[PDB]
Design a protein around this nucleic acid. Structure first.
Ligand SMILES: [Mg+2]
Ligand SMILES: [Mg+2]
Ligand SMILES: [Mg+2]
Ligand SMILES: [Mg+2]
Ligand SMILES: [Mg+2]
Ligand SMILES: [Mg+2]
Ligand SMILES: [Mg+2]
Ligand SMILES: [Mg+2]
Ligand SMILES: [Mg+2]
Ligand SMILES: [Mg+2]
Ligand SMILES: [Mg+2]
Ligand SMILES: [Mg+2]
Ligand SMILES: [Mg+2]
Ligand SMILES: [Mg+2]
Ligand SMILES: [Mg+2]
Ligand SMILES: [Mg+2]
Ligand SMILES: [Mg+2]
Ligand SMILES: [Mg+2]
Ligand SMILES: [Mg+2]
Ligand SMILES: [Mg+2]
Ligand SMILES: [Mg+2]
Ligand SMILES: [Mg+2]
Ligand SMILES: [Mg+2]
Ligand SMILES: [Mg+2]
Ligand SMILES: [Mg+2]
Ligand SMILES: [Mg+2]
Ligand SMILES: [Mg+2]
Ligand SMILES: [Mg+2]
Ligand SMILES: [Mg+2]
Ligand SMILES: [Mg+2]
Ligand SMILES: [Mg+2]
Lengths: 233, 32, 67, 115, 134
RNA sequence: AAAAUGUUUU
RNA sequence: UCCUGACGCUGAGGAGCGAAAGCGUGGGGAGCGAACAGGCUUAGAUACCCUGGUAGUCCACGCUGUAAACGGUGGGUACUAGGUGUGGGGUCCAUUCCACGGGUUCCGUGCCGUAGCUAACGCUUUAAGUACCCCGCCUGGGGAGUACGGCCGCAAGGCUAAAACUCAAAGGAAUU
RNA sequence: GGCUAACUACGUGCCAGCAGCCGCGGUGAUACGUAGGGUGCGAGCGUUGUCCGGAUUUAUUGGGCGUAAAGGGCUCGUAGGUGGUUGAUCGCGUCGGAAGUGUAAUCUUGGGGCUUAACCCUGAGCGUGCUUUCGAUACGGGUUGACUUGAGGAAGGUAGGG
């Protein structure tokens, strides 16, 4: 969308990148100016790329829409979850584990187990008595499953697209996504790869708000598409 | 290399050199 | 590492000039290593040659021994 | 998908995974699958009915199968060759091959309608 | 030292195409320019251009700009040198080579200039089989 | 600290 | 900046150089130390270990011409992500009107690493990648780098180099 | 027995024997011997010898040399192989016609004859070359002239247990 063009980007500081020490060579075209070691995003083609990502997410929600918001960095832990819960869009925030996208059967088994336990554990703790170190360990297992699984509850089948923040940390997600052929949209700074991302959105990924405004705008896009789905049906 | 090949060649060479040492005189009397 | 040991400059070496050679000779009387003396390779080579010449020519001790 | 120009390979290829080299050439109709066991099984499952396949390099079944597989993947269908070269099939590819493709398609039409 | 500038052109083109470079450059020669021209006319490269020297100020520079299709797809499936300096290959009008079953083109230098096999066969003229670009 | 060896079943 | 104007590359045979040990004549000989002697250990100990100790190690002039002489990777050339140390020559910049510093360029020398290659290990702009030119070399393991012959050498030996016979493996990397 | 189309019983007991390789026989042998049954061929069927193939296992087509067999210990350098850009010219390589030749038989193929076939006759092709002659000049080469980017040199700078 408009997102007041480059004004919001410049005020927030998206133009920041990484220094010369580590760099992905596929960024040769993507160079504005060498300012104080930190690489500078031109932020001009960024508008076009975010517009293209917006168009693709509109098309995905037109065909029905299922975006998996994957995130692990401390700069996005407290940002991804709130917007994903607001839009009602599936998300993972703590320890994206090997599988899920490929271990569909096991993850669905754990989804069913979590669904049944979230009721039976509460019924047992609130009703009939139970001894210690058994109810306690079941509650602890519930807590661990809740910590390691958030918005993954609601998915009937394989998703439609995945939104990635800090692909360097969440590398395995893109490998699974490319193996199973799902659209990928990711935040990439000057050290990431365009070959493994179809709809690439360059920009900083080291600040809390730097990923927060992008996740907020894509959440607004998802909410608008979900509203339009009422007429689309 | 498994060093076994070098050991086999080593033993063959050492045996031949011992043969040359023991038959040094006869060779120079009549032959190489 | 060794960058924190800032590169030191000396100008002319001049084995006669004992001040620099003392600054680069160890307290025991040895030639200090490059990573502790903070010299370039060429300057260190010149300093070592000058120290050896001064040693042979009695301007410097081969070993200061007792402190 | 494997591009078949009428029950036969489009053009000669040479594939190799690890050490399993497999050579494939198209053959006239009625030639059959002149191929070794593993490569012949691969071709027969792929549906090629006239092909000449030779197994160079190692004779291990797995590696020969992978070599036949990437030899088939190297096949380049005439329409996509034309797309690659920015030209037309009538401008890039042999008239005999295109014709044989038409007779194969029409004989195919006959079989379909007869069903 | 350089021995086959035509092979150098072919390997430069192959390496650039493999590395997905948009343009490749080399010192210019008449035969290189002719091969580039017929490559462009056969659609294996986007375009080509001969540049007057302005950096080395020494000799002309031949530059080939390549073409990659939708989803970054190679327009050249390979290029091979046939008539090597060590061993030269000449083909008659009847024994003209076929490349990729006829899909690719052999570049043949005939007495009537550089001509792709198809052309030569039409003119019933043979020559030196330079390349097998496909 | 030196401290060797291990026939032929069917 | 200047000069010559393809004069380049490689190179069978040939020639030279070629660690150490060794050989010849003469010199030298501290330390070290084959051989050797003795002491220990041991079933034995022609060994390890200890005490002695000659050639040799050193010098001069020759000879020998072989090494895991290995990067186990022939030379030349062009092209194909980077990242990061370090050695050498320039040149540029600011404060200097030194140098600290940063760049940039040409030539080395390491490490990491993409494409690519490889059986794997790994190699990867210093290729084991993509190519072209020339040379050396390989064709199962033993027998055998041995015999016969010839050449070289003072000698030790080196170089060139088989066959009969025999086995159905020998081998490379990696897995448990 | 597997490659390899086709299996059981009895006898034997590492014996007798089999085998092209892997191997079989030591008491339940589809592997020895016999029998029933079966399979492949058939006036033949096996064995031996020899050659080519498979063998890309001498790799021109069509392989390799870090560790599997394989880079000379290293360099210099002779013959040889190889050659940056370009003008002109020759037309040896190369390419295209023409003529001559490549007997016949064979071989491929079209017709014909033996009742069919083998075989036989006949037309054509092939005879992959060579000679003569007329063309073409892109490339290789010869002759000849330029160019400086490869290469070497000059001047200055310069590092080093050469
Ligand atoms: Mg191979
Ligand atoms: Mg001049
Ligand atoms: Mg010699
Ligand atoms: Mg010596
Ligand atoms: Mg002596
Ligand atoms: Mg003496
Ligand atoms: Mg002793
Ligand atoms: Mg050495
Ligand atoms: Mg060697
Ligand atoms: Mg050499
Ligand atoms: Mg090389
Ligand atoms: Mg370097
Ligand atoms: Mg290799
Ligand atoms: Mg000998
Ligand atoms: Mg059977
Ligand atoms: Mg029995
Ligand atoms: Mg053969
Ligand atoms: Mg044979
Ligand atoms: Mg081989
Ligand atoms: Mg080589
Ligand atoms: Mg070896
Ligand atoms: Mg070497
Ligand atoms: Mg030698
Ligand atoms: Mg010469
Ligand atoms: Mg030339
Ligand atoms: Mg000309
Ligand atoms: Mg006839
Ligand atoms: Mg008849
Ligand atoms: Mg005839
Ligand atoms: Mg010429
Ligand atoms: Mg000078």
């Amino acid at each position: 969308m408009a997102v007041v063009t480059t004004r919001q980007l410049l005020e927030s500081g998206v133009h920041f990148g990484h220094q010369t020490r580590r760099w992905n060579p596929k960024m040769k075209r993507f160079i504005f100016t060498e300012r104080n070691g930190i690489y500078i995003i031109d932020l001009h083609q960024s508008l076009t790329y975010i517009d293209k990502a917006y168009a693709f997410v509109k098309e995905t929600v037109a065909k029905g829409g299922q975006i998996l918001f994957v995130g692990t960095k401390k700069q996005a832990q407290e940002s991804i979850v709130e917007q994903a819960t607001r839009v009602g869009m599936p998300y993972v925030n703590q320890r994206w584990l090997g599988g899920m996208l490929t271990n569909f059967q096991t993850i669905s088994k754990r989804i069913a187990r979590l669904k049944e336990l979230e009721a039976m554990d509460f019924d047992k703790v609130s009703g009939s008595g139970l001894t210690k170190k058994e109810l306690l360990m079941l509650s602890r297992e519930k807590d661990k499953l809740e910590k390691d699984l958030g918005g993954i509850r609601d998915m009937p089948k394989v998703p439609q697209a995945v939104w990635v923040v800090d692909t360097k940390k969440e590398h395995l997600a893109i490998d699974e996504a490319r193996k199973l052929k799902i659209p990928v949209v990711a935040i990439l700074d000057t050290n990431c790869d365009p070959d493994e991302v179809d709809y690439a959105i360059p920009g900083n990924d080291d600040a809390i708000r730097s990923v927060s405004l992008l996740t907020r705008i894509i959440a607004d896009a998802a909410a608008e598409g979900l509203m339009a789905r009422s007429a689309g049906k | 290399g498994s060093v076994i090949k070098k050991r086999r060649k080593r033993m063959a060479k050492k045996k031949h050199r011992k043969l040359l040492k023991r038959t040094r005189i006869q060779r120079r009397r009549a032959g190489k | 590492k060794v960058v924190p040991i800032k590169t030191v400059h000396i100008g002319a070496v001049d084995y006669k000039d004992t001040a620099l050679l003392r600054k680069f000779i160890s307290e025991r009387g040895k030639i200090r290593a490059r990573r502790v003396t903070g010299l370039s390779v060429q300057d260190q080579r010149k300093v070592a040659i000058a120290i050896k010449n001064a040693r042979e020519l009695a301007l410097l001790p081969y070993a200061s021994t007792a402190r | 998908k494997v591009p078949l120009v009428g029950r036969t390979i489009t053009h000669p290829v040479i594939g190799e995974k690890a050490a399993g080299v497999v050579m494939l050439r198209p053959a006239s109709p009625g030639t059959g699958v002149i191929a070794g066991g593993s490569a012949r099984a691969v071709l027969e499952c792929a549906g090629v009915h006239d092909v000449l396949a030779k197994s160079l390099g190692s004779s291990n079944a797995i590696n020969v199968v992978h070599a036949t597989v990437d030899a088939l993947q190297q096949l380049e269908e005439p329409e996509e060759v034309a797309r690659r070269r920015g030209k037309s099939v009538e401008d890039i590819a042999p008239a005999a091959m295109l014709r044989a493709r038409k007779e194969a398609d029409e004989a195919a039409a006959a079989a379909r309608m007869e069903e | 030292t350089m021995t086959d500038p035509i092979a150098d052109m072919l390997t430069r083109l192959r390496n650039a195409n493999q590395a997905y470079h948009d343009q490749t450059s080399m010192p210019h020669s008449k035969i290189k320019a002719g091969i580039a021209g017929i490559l462009k006319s056969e659609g294996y490269i986007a375009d080509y251009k001969v540049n007057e020297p302005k950096e080395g100020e020494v000799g002309k520079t031949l530059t080939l700009t390549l073409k990659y299709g939708e989803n970054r797809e190679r327009s050249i499936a390979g290029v091979r040198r046939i008539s090597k300096p060590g061993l030269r290959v000449y083909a008659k009008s009847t024994a003209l080579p076929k490349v990729l079953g006829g899909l690719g083109i052999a570049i043949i230098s005939t007495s009537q200039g550089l001509l792709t096999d198809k052309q030569a066969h039409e003119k019933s003229v043979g020559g030196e089989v330079l390349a097998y670009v496909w």
